[PDB]
């Protein structure tokens, strides 16, 4: 029938295979150890997300500096959202098939304190009973949810790409009461800014802390350094579906 492929079905194939953490099961668990193992995983997850974004039609056509800004602004949204999905498809947290934060690990010192935020995303997906195709449009929009105060360099093209995926999600919803579910799902998107703020707050604070000894891979460290000034000056604009 449709031997010409929908934008959704393209996103379906470009979705990167899920990465293992490499966490050792013989060594005892620790908050120190889990966080570091998670940071390393985070780095490889970002490299995957770059390859992913480049495959999004239109994206590779933005200014290269814009492509950078979008990935720098949105990496945490993408990671947290995908986490929420993984956790929903398997209330626990599936960072990786080999590193699941279960009931017991949750009780580790300083653990649930951050995990509550990531759990929130996961319980929203289960609540709203989100489908896979909806998910793929939502994550795409998450790549496009923040911009600098005075816009991007290819603002027009960006505006048009974003407008495209808003429509794409609308199709996902119907292909599955319409406009209310749209509200619902776009309200979840809006509320990612609040999740990410918390997650980034703890991330930056840990990154900058002298006596904390938690390692970060270079991939993440360059971005964290490249963003701390921007967020602590206010050049970020959070694009909201509802004012």
């Amino acid at each position: 029938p449709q031997l010409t492929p929908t934008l959704v079905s393209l996103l379906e194939v470009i979705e990167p295979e899920v990465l293992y953490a490499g966490y050792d099961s013989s060594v005892p668990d620790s908050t120190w150890r889990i966080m570091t193992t998670l940071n390393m995983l985070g780095g490889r997850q970002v490299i995957a997300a770059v390859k992913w974004a480049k495959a999004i039609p239109g994206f590779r056509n933005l200014h290269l500096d814009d492509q950078m800004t979008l990935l720098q602004y949105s990496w945490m949204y993408l990671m947290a959202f995908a986490l929420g999905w993984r956790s929903y498809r398997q209330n626990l947290l599936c960072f990786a098939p080999d590193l699941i934060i279960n009931e017991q690990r949750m009780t580790l010192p300083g653990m649930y304190d951050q995990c509550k935020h990531m759990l929130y995303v996961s319980s929203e997906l289960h609540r709203l009973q989100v489908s896979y195709e909806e998910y793929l449009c939502m994550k795409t929009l998450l790549l496009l949810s923040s911009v600098p105060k005075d816009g991007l360099k290819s603002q027009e093209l960006f505006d048009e790409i974003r407008m495209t995926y808003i429509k794409e999600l609308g199709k996902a919803i119907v292909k599955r009461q319409n406009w209310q579910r749209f509200y619902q799902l776009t309200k979840l998107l809006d509320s990612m800014h609040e999740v990410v703020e918390n997650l980034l707050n703890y991330c930056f604070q840990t990154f900058l802390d002298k006596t904390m000894s938690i390692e970060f891979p270079e991939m993440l460290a360059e971005i964290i350094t490249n963003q701390i000034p921007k967020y602590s000056n206010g050049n970020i604009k959070k694009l909201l579906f509802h004012q």
Partner: peptide
């Protein structure tokens, strides 16, 4: 950040 710039190119 050159590595990202590189991975994007």
């Amino acid at each position: 950040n050159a590595l990202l710039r590189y991975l994007l190119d």
